[PDB]
């Protein structure tokens, strides 16, 4: 806040600015595809 | 003091001179005029 006051009028304590803290947590977006060894070995696509 | 002593009479004790202390205490004399910063800024004459 910014106060106005006057000539010869005492000055009140203005409220100090506030600070906010955003906690951006990290979280693992994992992929766990259980492919069989059958597909990898049999196919010529190299499915990995 | 000085005695007008004589011949037969003995010389009694004369009163010694007294010394006086003058205690001139240093006291503060002060002016504490509250001027508004407004008057300092706005006066055409150097108000301070």
Cα(A42)–Cα(A2) distance, integer angstroms: 75
How far is C-alpha B47 from the geometric centre of its chain's CA atoms?
35
Q: Which of B14, B48, B18, B19 is nearest to B31 (CA)?
A: B48
| Residue A47 · residue A35 · CB < 8 Å | yes
Documented resolution in Å: 3.2
Task: Establish if B41 touches chain A: CB-CB under 8 angstroms.
Answer: no
Chain B's closest residue to A9, CA to CA, is B36
The closest alpha carbon to A40, from A29, A48, A28, A31, belongs to A48
């Amino acid at each position: 806040t910014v106060n106005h006051g006057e000539e010869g009028k005492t000055r009140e304590q203005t409220s100090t600015p506030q600070i906010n803290e955003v906690s951006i947590k990290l979280y693992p977006v994992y992929a766990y595809p259980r492919t069989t060894q059958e597909i990898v070995d049999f196919s010529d696509v190299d499915i990995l």
